[PDB]
């Protein structure tokens, strides 16, 4: 038996990764500057030379190219890993190029990320291990706070998408070049892009 990757996912191309990463940074710089954000600072961090630099706050960022993870396998140790990797669709798609659609950027006290909206064919690659449809958790992580783990970004996203589903999104508290800014409370923020970003990526396995 040959062992599996650390994980499967869509790995963005150099160009797409650079584009998204840069858009992510601009958003953190813009957000940290926004009046509506500075007002809610107490809900973002507990601690207290007045401005918070969000780029600094999300002090852990992906070292290489950005990526959208499907199944964490831990070389076969993760539950369902073998079952996921044995699927025809996974084996067929391995090394194939895809286009991912980014619909929004979001920030919480724990993570910063980009929401990915998967096509139906891409959803075939989403593992099957709430009231939101499958694949809602899909995202690209842009940054995390010092003690936060990668799995958190997907959780943060779902929590945001639930707030939207319930109509607690609210009126846009601002307008950024790329879209409307929304305050969901508890340090949560979302930029709904006027125009969805398309990024190119390759579906494959990372071995560490």
Residue numbers in the entry: 162 to 209, 212 to 292, 300 to 378
What does the study report here?
2′,3′-cyclic nucleotide 3′-phosphodiesterase (CNPase) comprises 4% of total myelin protein in the central nervous system (CNS), being the most abundant CNS non-compact myelin protein4. CNPase consists of an N-terminal polynucleotide kinase-like domain10, a catalytic phosphodiesterase domain11, and a membrane-anchored C-terminal tail, which contains a cysteine residue that undergoes isoprenylation. The catalytic domain enables the rapid hydrolysis of nucleoside 2′,3′-cyclic phosphates to nucleoside 2′-phosphates. The CNPase catalytic site, lying in a groove between two lobes, has pseudo two-fold symmetry and contains two apposing His-X-Thr-X (X denotes a hydrophobic residue) motifs, characteristic for 2H phosphoesterases 113537.
In mouse CNPase, this is done by His230, Thr232, His309, and Thr311, in a manner, where a nucleophilic water molecule activated by His309 can attack the cyclic phosphate and a pentavalent transition state is formed. Mutation of active-site histidine residues (H230Q, H230S, H309Q, H309S, and H230Q/H309Q double mutant) abolishes CNPase activity. Overall, the structures of H230S, H309S, H230Q, H309Q, and H230Q/H309Q are highly similar. However, only H230S and H309S could be used to trap nucleotide ligands within the active site, whereas H309Q and the H230Q/H309Q double mutant could not. The results indicate that all the variants were correctly folded and heat-stable, with the largest destabilization, 8–9 °C, caused by the H230Q/H309Q double mutation. The catalytic motif, thus, is also important for CNPase stability.
